[PDB]
Amino acid sequence: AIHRIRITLTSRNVKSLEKVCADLIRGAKEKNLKVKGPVRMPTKTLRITTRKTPCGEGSKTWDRFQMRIHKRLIDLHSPSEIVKQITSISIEPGVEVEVTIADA
Amino acid sequence: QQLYWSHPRKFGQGSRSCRVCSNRHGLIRKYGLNMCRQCFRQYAKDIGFIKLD
């Protein structure tokens, strides 16, 4: 089927993120017909370097911070009654779900 | 009176400032972070940044 919805997941804790996928595809393979498999996008890597000292003097050393971002996406063929049901399934940790209504 | 704030700042390094320390030298303009360098390194972890390499 009726609507063609799409769900997206961005987060950092991979284990939390790979978990909720397993949870949602379980309920989808539970009560549905045919959905998708997780399309794994390449990670992003934010990278910053600084001088490790506040002042200027010293020996010339550096530091390199970063953070990775992990991203996934899936779609379903069904009426939107289902998405209002299964977007409530205990998605506690830092995990951004972003979901479209029909193909967008 | 009218000549108080007459200077058209609008650009440069005497326009921006570290949001927290209210400083002007050594800023970071990447991802709207707009933060003094020492100040960034200080916190740098609630933000989620860490270092592995």
Binding site: T10, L46, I69 | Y31, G32, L33, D46, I47
Partner: peptide, 19 residues
């Protein structure tokens, strides 16, 4: 968001919030 900002700039400001 409303301004349709990148996911990069999003997570960052989400941290600046908590600080």
């Amino acid at each position: 968001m409303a301004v349709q900002i990148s996911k990069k700039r999003k997570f960052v400001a989400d941290g600046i919030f908590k600080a």
